[PDB]
Amino acid sequence: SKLRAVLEKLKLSRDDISTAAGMVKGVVDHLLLRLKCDSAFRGVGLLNTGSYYEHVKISAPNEFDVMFKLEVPRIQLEEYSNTRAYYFVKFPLSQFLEGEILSASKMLSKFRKIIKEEINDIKDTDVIMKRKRGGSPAVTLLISEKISVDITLALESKSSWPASTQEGLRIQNWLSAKVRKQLRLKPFYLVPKHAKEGNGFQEETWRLSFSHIEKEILNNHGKSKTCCENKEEKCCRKDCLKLMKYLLEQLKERFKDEEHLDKFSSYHVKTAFFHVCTQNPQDSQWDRKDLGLCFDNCVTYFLQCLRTEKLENYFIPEFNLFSSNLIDKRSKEFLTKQIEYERNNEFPVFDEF
Ligand SMILES: Nc1ncnc2c1ncn2[C@@H]1O[C@H](COP(=O)(O)OP(=O)(O)NP(=O)(O)O)[C@@H](O)[C@H]1O
Ligand SMILES: C[C@@H](C(=O)Nc1cc(Cl)cc(-c2ncc[nH]2)c1)N(C)C(=O)c1cccnc1C(=O)O
Ligand SMILES: [Mn+2]
Ligand SMILES: [Mn+2]
Ligand SMILES: [Zn+2]
C-alpha cells in the first residue's frame, strides 16, 4: 500500500495537463510552421515522443519531447568505427555537406539558430532557449519558466533498419513475432548526437533513435490486446516503470552534489524495464495485486545490470549502456550502494516525511 500511495502522489493533475498541453502545442506548432519557411527544413514534420506521450510522465507535466523529422531521399548510411549506434549520412541541403558527408553538427547548428531567432519574435508567451546541454541532440525551450520542451531534429529513413539492430527488439515471446515484423517495417531515425572521438567528438556523425518504437511498445504493452482496457486486465507494467523512474529521479536529486550519479538517466531504467518485460512476457506476471513483487523484480534486475556492468540497448544489443567506456565502475558501484540501501529499508526515499 506504500507503493500505491507513492503512485497516487505521482499522478499528473488534470488541470496541469490541460494548461501545459495548450501551451506546448501552441509554441511547437508555431515553430514548426516557421521552420517550414526555411529552404533547408521545408519538409519537416512533427512526432511526439517520450514519457508524456507514453503516459509515464510523473509528478508534473513539465517536460515534453518532440521530434522534428525530415525525410532525406536516397540516404546512404555508413557505420562509424564499429560503434553500432553512430553513423555517417551520405547523400537546399548542400549547405550541410562536408564532402559527400551530411554533417550532423552543421544541420543542428542551423536548426538551433532558426529556433533561437523565432522564439525571440514570440511576444505573446514567455519562451526562452536553455543553454546547450552536453551530448544532447535536442534544442531545449523553457515556457513560462516552468515547462521544458526538447525539440530534436531527426532524419527519417524508410529503409530497412541497420544491421546492428538484427538481433535487437526481442519481443517475440511477449508482443509476438508478427508485431516485431510490423515494427521493423516502420521508419527509423537519426538524431544529431555525435560519437566520441578521443577526448572530443566526431561532429559529422548521427545516432540511431527508436524513441517512436518505444512509444508504440509502451502504449500497446500487453500480450493481450485488451491489456489495461478493462477491470480484469489492469496490469502494473507502467506503474513499475513510473516507480523505477521516481527512484532514480529522487536519488539523483539527493546526491546531486556528488558527480557519481550525473551520467544516469531515465533511459537506463526504461531500457532495463523493457528487458524485464522480455523476461516476463505474460500479463499474468504483471498482475496489479502483485505490484510489490513486480517492482522488486524490476529493482533487482536493475541492480544486477549495475553489478555486471551490462545493460544492452534494447534495439542495438552490442551497444552496452553500462560499458565502462560510458560510465565509470565507481559510479555504477555508488548507484548500486544507494539502491541496495533503498531496497533493504523499504524505499525511504519515497517518503514525503
Ligand atoms: N541514452 C539514450 N539513448 C537512446 N535514446 C535515448 C537516450 N536518452 C533519451 N533517449 C530518447 O529520448 C527520449 C526523451 O528523453 P527523456 O526526456 O530524457 O526521457 P523520457 O523517456 O521522456 N523520461 P522523462 O522525461 O524523465 O519522464 C526517450 O524517451 C528516449 O526515446
Ligand atoms: C543523454 C541525453 C541524450 O543522449 N538524449 C537522447 C539520445 C538519443 Cl540517441 C536520442 C534522443 C531522442 N530521440 C528522440 C528524441 N530524443 C535523445 N539526454 C538524456 C538528454 O539530453 C536529456 C536530459 C534530460 C531530459 N531530456 C533529455 C532528452 O534527451 O530528451
Ligand atoms: Mn521526457
Ligand atoms: Mn527530454
Ligand atoms: Zn496492461
UniProtKB/Swiss-Prot annotation:
The modification Phosphoserine is found at residues 51, 136, 265-266. Changing residue 9 to A: No effect on stimulation of interferon production. There is a cross-link at residues 11, 116, 178, 215, 242, 245, 258-259, 310 (Glycyl lysine isopeptide (Lys-Gly) (interchain with G-Cter in ubiquitin)). GO terms for molecular function: 2',3'-cyclic GMP-AMP synthase activity; ATP binding; chromatin binding; DNA binding; double-stranded DNA binding; GTP binding; metal ion binding; molecular condensate scaffold activity. Changing residue 305 to S: Abolished palmitoylation by ZDHHC18, leading to increased DNA-binding and enzyme activity. Monomer in the absence of DNA. Homodimer in presence of dsDNA: forms a 2:2 dimer with two enzymes binding to two DNA molecules. Interacts with nucleosomes; interaction is mainly mediated via histones H2A and H2B and inactivates the nucleotidyltransferase activity by blocking DNA-binding and subsequent activation. Interacts with PQBP1 (via WW domain). Interacts with TRIM14; this interaction recruits USP14, leading to deubiquitinate and stabilize CGAS and promote type I interferon production. Interacts with ZCCHC3; promoting sensing of dsDNA by CGAS. (Microbial infection) Interacts with herpes virus 8/HHV-8 protein ORF52; this interaction inhibits cGAS enzymatic activity by preventing the formation of liquid-like droplets by CGAS. Changing residue 11 to R: Strongly decreased ubiquitination by RNF185. The modification (Microbial infection) Deamidated asparagine is found at residues 48, 220. Changing residue 234 to E: Abolishes stimulation of interferon production. It is a peripheral membrane protein. Residues 172-213 are annotated as: Interaction with collided ribosomes. The modification (Microbial infection) Deamidated glutamine is found at residues 282, 285. Changing residue 313 to H: Gains susceptibility to mouse-specific RU.521. Changing residue 69 to R: Reduced sumoylation. This is Cyclic GMP-AMP synthase. Changing residue 29 to A: Abolished poly-ADP-ribosylation by PARP1, stimulating interferon production. Changing residue 134 to E: Found in patients with tumors; dominant mutation; reduced nucleotidyltransferase activity. Belongs to the mab-21 family. Changing residue 231 to E: Abolishes stimulation of interferon production. Changing residue 160 to A: Decreased interaction with histones H2A and H2B. The keyword Membrane applies. ATP binds at residues 51, 63-65, 211-214, 245, 266-270. Lys-25 and Leu-33 residues are specific to human and destabilize the interactions with short DNA, shifting the specificity toward the detection of curved long DNAs. Lys-25 and Leu-33 also restrain cGAMP production and, therefore, immune activation, allowing a more fine-tuned response to pathogens. Residues 11-53, 215-238 are annotated as: DNA-binding. Induction: By type I interferons.
